[PDB]
Structure formats: structure tokens, C-alpha cells
Amino acid sequence: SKNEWRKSAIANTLLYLRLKNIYVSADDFVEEQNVYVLPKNLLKKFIEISDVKIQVAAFIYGMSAKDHPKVKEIKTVVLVPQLGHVGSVQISNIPDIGDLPDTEGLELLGWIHTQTEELKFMAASEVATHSKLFADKKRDCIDISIFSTPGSVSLSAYNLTDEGYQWGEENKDIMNVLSEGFEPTFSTHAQLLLSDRITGNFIIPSGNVWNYTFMGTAFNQEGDYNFKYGIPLEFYNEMHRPVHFLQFS
């Protein structure tokens, strides 16, 4: 619907106001665990480009800080082609950004995403998505979950347990008419800090578009996509609107 598209784009124009009230998860320090540090500028943009209803996700990359090897500063957010849902998101593969400058020395740290339900653990869909991405690759990757609701955003970071990965691998394609054997205790608290004392940037798809929610037939979940440094488009940018052509070859 043209009218619904117009209304939904307007609804997102107020998302910047949620950055006026930011809540970050905190717990007793554990010296054996890493501390993950998110630049405020990345959070601001990430929220600005998100949706009030449909989940939006991206990969986080970074490296150790100067003061301490166990402080991981997030340098770059990689927005990859995805197809979002209420309560879940289909994310394309861990991206190849090796051909880009200043990517040497960057570690894959995990993923970041928005959600519209307040929880104290990774949801069933979160667990499945996380396992699909990281189970055979890098199990120490974190999940930064952002509860986005009128007036505010709340940030919590999680690790997935081996039990969590085990169960996630048994649920390969998502449809939450499911969740048999799901346990809220599959995830543990990871240590997160928000900081305006550091700044970060974005890597985006070579063709700019990342939101395939309304272009499902063109989405290639197992696609080999190309990437570049850039400014990410907002969810209801007109470039994300489906268009049709009649072909004569």
C-alpha cells in the first residue's frame, strides 16, 4: 500500500528523540570478561536508520584499546543486506571487507540489532540467528540487543552458551510457531559501555540498499555481496521501495 508506506516512513522521523533517554545494562565487574565499548555516534545513526516495528541488524567490528587489551572498542558497523520481520531478521553472511582500506587489524566482535519486546535474555529467534552466524566461525561473538520503544532505547549485551549454540543449530530456518526446548538461560550477560569519547564509521553494500523487507524476490541470503565505506540509508528510503520492470531482450 502506498498510503501505509507513507505513514510508516513518517513514524520513523521521530526515532532521533529516543536518543534523549539511553539506558545501558550494568552488572558487577568480572575481570576475566572483555568490556565492549560502543561509540555514541554509531548508536545515534543506527537508531536513526531503524524502524519502529521491524527489526534491523548489523555486524560489529573492532579491536583492543590502548589502556587495556580486554577493552574492545567497536570501530565499524557493517550494515548487510537483510530481510526484517516483527520479532526476527534474516541476515546475509558474515561480510568480506578485506579489500577495503583500514580493515586490517579489525576483529569480528558480533552483531547489533533492535527489538520491540523487553527481555532479560536472547529470544528464541535471536539464539537461532546468532548460532547460524557464529557457531562454526567464532563462538565468543556477542549480541548487542536494543529495546526500542516510544521515548527511549535500552542496550544489553549477551554471550550464547554451548547449550545455546547446540539448540540453535537444531533450528535452522526461523518461524517462531516453535520454540520447543528454548531456554532463557541459554544466554549470559556480557559487559557493555556507551562512550562519546570514541567515534566509529559504517560499511554499507556496494549498491547502497540494505533493506530487502519489501524486495524479497531480489534478496539473496547466501549472496556474495560487495561492500564500501559510506552513509547508510534509512529503512523507508525510496531506494528500498519495490519497483517492477517489463523486459525485452
DSSP 70-115: TEEEEEEEE---EEEETTEEEE-PPP--TTSTT-TTPEEEEEEEEE
- The answer to whether residues 158 and 143 touch, using CB atoms and an 8 Å cutoff, is yes
CA separation for the pair 247, 232 (Å, rounded): 30
Do the domain assignments include residue 249? no
* DSSP secondary structure of 215-228: -GGG--TT----EE
- The answer to whether residues 200 and 75 touch, using CB atoms and an 8 Å cutoff, is yes
CA separation for the pair 227, 209 (Å, rounded): 11
Q: Residue 112 sits in which domain range? A: 1-241
Do the domain assignments include residue 246? no
Do the domain assignments include residue 204? yes
Q: Alpha carbon 25 to chain centroid distance? A: 17
Q: From which experimental method does this structure derive?
A: X-ray
Q: What is the CATH number of the domain that holds 121?
A: 3.40.140.10
Q: Which residues contact 127 (CB under 8 A, 6 or more apart)?
A: 160, 164, 167, 168, 171, 182, 186, 187
Which SS3 state, helix, strand or coil, does residue 43 take?
Answer: helix
Q: What resolution in Å is listed for this PDB structure?
A: 2.0
Do the domain assignments include residue 247? no
- The answer to whether residues 45 and 15 touch, using CB atoms and an 8 Å cutoff, is no
b/e burial code for range 208-223 (CB count within 10 A of at least 16 → b): eebbbbebeeeeeeee
Number of H helices, E strands in the chain: 4, 12
CA separation for the pair 231, 43 (Å, rounded): 14
Q: How many folded domains does the chain comprise?
A: 1
